[PDB]
């Protein structure tokens, strides 16, 4: 009987964790836009790593899911590619980052609907 609170709380707490791991990525997204410094692009990397952590393990410990899942990982970390190499090479006027990561986001929000 303690062992159904148990899960309970346990899904409560992983599920915390999980929308506050949301609210780090849109939070650090936002400030890498207000200035594109190094240390905030790795707040942005970093929450987005901690944000597929957390999914993989709810969506695994649960085929169609998988295999977004892997796929739309694929296209983060691309884009994720994109953005980073094109801070380093400085090309400012056409990186257009307000957008990249709202595009970005987007697809860290489909993951968290699923």
Same mark, same amino acid.
């Given at each position: 009987?303690?062992?159904?609170? /148990?899960?309970?709380?346990?899904?409560? $707490?992983?599920?915390?964790? /999980? *929308?506050?791991?949301?609210?780090?990525?849109?939070?650090?997204?936002?400030?890498?836009?207000?200035?594109? &410094?190094?240390?905030?692009?790795?707040?942005?990397?970093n929450?987005?790593?901690?944000?597929?952590?957390?999914?993989?393990?709810?969506? #695994?410990?649960?085929?169609?899911?998988?295999?977004?899942? $892997?796929l739309?990982? *694929?296209?983060?970390? *691309?884009?994720? !590619?994109?953005? &980073?190499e094109?801070? !380093?090479?400085?090309?400012?006027? &056409?990186?257009?980052?307000?957008?990249?990561? *709202?595009?970005?986001?987007?697809?860290?929000?489909?993951? #968290?609907?699923?």
């Amino acid at each position: 009987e303690f062992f159904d609170i /148990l899960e309970d709380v346990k899904e409560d $707490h992983f599920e915390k964790l /999980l *929308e506050e791991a949301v609210e780090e990525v849109i939070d650090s997204g936002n400030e890498l836009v207000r200035s594109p &410094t190094p240390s905030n692009l790795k707040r942005y990397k970093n929450a987005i790593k901690e944000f597929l952590k957390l999914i993989e393990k709810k969506i #695994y410990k649960l085929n169609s899911g998988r295999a977004r899942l $892997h796929l739309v990982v *694929e296209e983060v970390n *691309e884009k994720l !590619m994109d953005l &980073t190499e094109k801070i !380093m090479k400085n090309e400012w006027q &056409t990186i257009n980052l307000a957008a990249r990561i *709202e595009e970005i986001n987007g697809l860290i929000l489909n993951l #968290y609907r699923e």
